[PDB]
Design an enzyme around this catalytic site. Structure first.
Site, mmCIF file in Angstrom:
data_model
loop_
_atom_site.group_PDB
_atom_site.id
_atom_site.type_symbol
_atom_site.label_atom_id
_atom_site.label_comp_id
_atom_site.label_asym_id
_atom_site.label_seq_id
_atom_site.Cartn_x
_atom_site.Cartn_y
_atom_site.Cartn_z
ATOM 1 N N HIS A 155 -1.180 -1.894 -21.977
ATOM 2 C CA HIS A 155 -0.875 -0.590 -21.402
ATOM 3 C C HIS A 155 0.267 -0.703 -20.407
ATOM 4 C CE1 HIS A 155 -3.983 -2.743 -19.235
ATOM 5 N NE2 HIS A 155 -3.581 -2.160 -18.121
ATOM 6 N N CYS A 176 5.321 -2.039 3.677
ATOM 7 C CA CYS A 176 5.718 -0.764 3.086
ATOM 8 C C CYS A 176 6.870 -0.959 2.104
ATOM 9 C CB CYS A 176 6.137 0.219 4.176
ATOM 10 S SG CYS A 176 6.741 1.808 3.569
ATOM 11 N N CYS A 211 10.229 1.264 3.611
ATOM 12 C CA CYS A 211 10.969 0.975 4.843
ATOM 13 C C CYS A 211 10.821 -0.464 5.327
ATOM 14 C CB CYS A 211 10.544 1.922 5.962
ATOM 15 S SG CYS A 211 9.025 1.396 6.778
ATOM 16 N N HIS A 255 0.387 5.397 6.711
ATOM 17 C CA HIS A 255 1.835 5.302 6.725
ATOM 18 C C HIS A 255 2.458 5.730 5.395
ATOM 19 C CE1 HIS A 255 5.811 3.820 7.869
ATOM 20 N NE2 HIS A 255 5.867 3.277 6.668
ATOM 21 N N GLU A 306 5.353 8.500 4.702
ATOM 22 C CA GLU A 306 6.536 8.150 3.926
ATOM 23 C C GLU A 306 6.750 9.139 2.795
ATOM 24 O OE1 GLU A 306 8.930 6.537 4.521
ATOM 25 O OE2 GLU A 306 8.605 4.464 5.144
#
Ligand SMILES: Nc1ncnc2c1ncn2[C@@H]1O[C@H](COP(=O)(O)O)[C@@H](O)[C@H]1O
Ligand SMILES: Nc1ncnc2c1ncn2[C@@H]1O[C@H](COP(=O)(O)O)[C@@H](O)[C@H]1O
Ligand SMILES: [Zn+2]
Ligand SMILES: [Zn+2]
Lengths: 200, 200
Positions: free
Chosen positions: A115, A168, A171, A185, A189
């Site tokens: 998949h 993240c 960033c 966060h 974002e």
DNA sequence: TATTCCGATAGTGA
DNA sequence: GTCACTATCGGAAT
């Protein structure tokens, strides 16, 4: 086995409303536990290829790879953009969405039926419940469909990635192993990205 | 500081119903978070001695040790047996109870005011909530009041004990780190002991 | 590096 | 090795 849970979609796509496309060769199905706002799975219906490991697919089945990429960028493109607009915002253009979508295989799948993941970048979802989820989609463990063969990871070697600190994707800020803080966060974002994207 | 929480009992025993004995020298108070069916604290009211570390007490304050033992085995003995009968069963004799009671200091107390633990052996209590609780009372970390000086543990050296596998104090059965399973077993052990104790 | 339940482990604040 | 809250981490069944 729970590992065979996806086979019903390639055997009987006619039975599932969340199968948003099927033909003789492939099935596009919504991921039952989306790890981003939009999260779809593109599966081969070929009885042999379905059980070939993704890294082997990438390495030695370039015809299938090309065929899957062709579906995504061609006959399924409009469908995927609508799904994305529905999951994110109607105000997002194809251009903006194309740069907010990633396509790839897990280097070590849990489900046995091949998949291809097609999903947005946000990772904002109730089903994103732990660090391993996040890391599996944002590290070399996620093998993008356009990875050159010579740059594929080796089967079974990525175990250590899941113990690393959280970062993240957008960033670069780090969160140690504080998954809950990463989660909050990621929401910010997304809000930020959305505001900037429509406002283009 | 939370570490001074017990000082109120020696400063103002008159203000607390759970202070079941006081005089100019000592206070006997119920433990607010009993780690066995009966759990009491015997505290010196001496302004200096209260802040002496229990291992130092055991080593160099034999008069105070003898005085505490004298309280326990003498003027407080009937009181303690009644507390035990109330917490366990009215059907238990002083003789049976005396062999089901332990008296000692923690080698590394959390509370700063010297307090001698006096408690039954069962460790059946809602307040017993983790492995460290159990281990602190069933290992050399629990310094029995009749420990010969030459056999005292050294201050600050027992940290490693708390990582060890769990073992039933009564029958020896091990439980790995499965605290919940130990808890259920401790309940059985008490029922067994009680049945055997009253039956004669 | 499937999900879900449950429990052990770990840092904090007080 | 205070308690209580929150969250991470860990196995087991499915
Ligand atoms: N019954 C199901 N229907 C649809 N998707 C599922 C089901 N069970 C698991 N999944 C998804 O299948 C994916 C497995 O991908 P992988 O980790 O590469 O095996 C995960 O994203 C799961 O959320
Ligand atoms: N406010 C309180 N009143 C009475 N006992 C307490 C209180 N707070 C803690 N305790 C008990 O004091 C004991 C501390 O023993 P130690 O670990 O030797 O310092 C523990 O058994 C606690 O359950
Ligand atoms: Zn960020
Ligand atoms: Zn036992």
């Amino acid at each position: 086995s729970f590992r065979d849970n996806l086979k019903v979609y390639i055997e009987s796509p006619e039975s599932y409303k969340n199968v948003i496309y099927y033909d003789d060769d492939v099935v596009l199905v919504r991921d039952m536990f989306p790890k981003s706002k939009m999260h779809l799975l593109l599966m081969t219906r070929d009885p042999h290829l379905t059980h070939v490991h993704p890294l082997e697919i990438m390495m030695k089945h370039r015809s299938l790879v090309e065929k899957l990429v062709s579906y995504v960028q061609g006959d399924l493109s409009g469908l995927i953009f609508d799904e994305a607009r529905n999951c994110l915002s109607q105000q997002l253009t194809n251009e903006a969405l194309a740069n907010y979508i990633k396509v790839g295989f897990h280097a070590g799948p849990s489900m046995n039926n091949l998949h291809l993941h097609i999903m947005t970048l946000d990772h904002v979802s109730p089903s994103l419940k732990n660090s391993a989820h996040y890391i599996s989609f944002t590290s070399p463990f996620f093998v993008k469909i356009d990875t050159p063969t010579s740059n594929l990871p080796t089967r079974g070697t990525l175990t250590s990635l899941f113990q690393e600190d959280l970062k993240c994707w957008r960033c670069g800020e780090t969160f140690g192993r504080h998954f809950t803080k990463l989660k909050a966060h990621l929401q910010e974002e997304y809000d930020d990205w959305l505001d900037k994207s429509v406002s283009m």
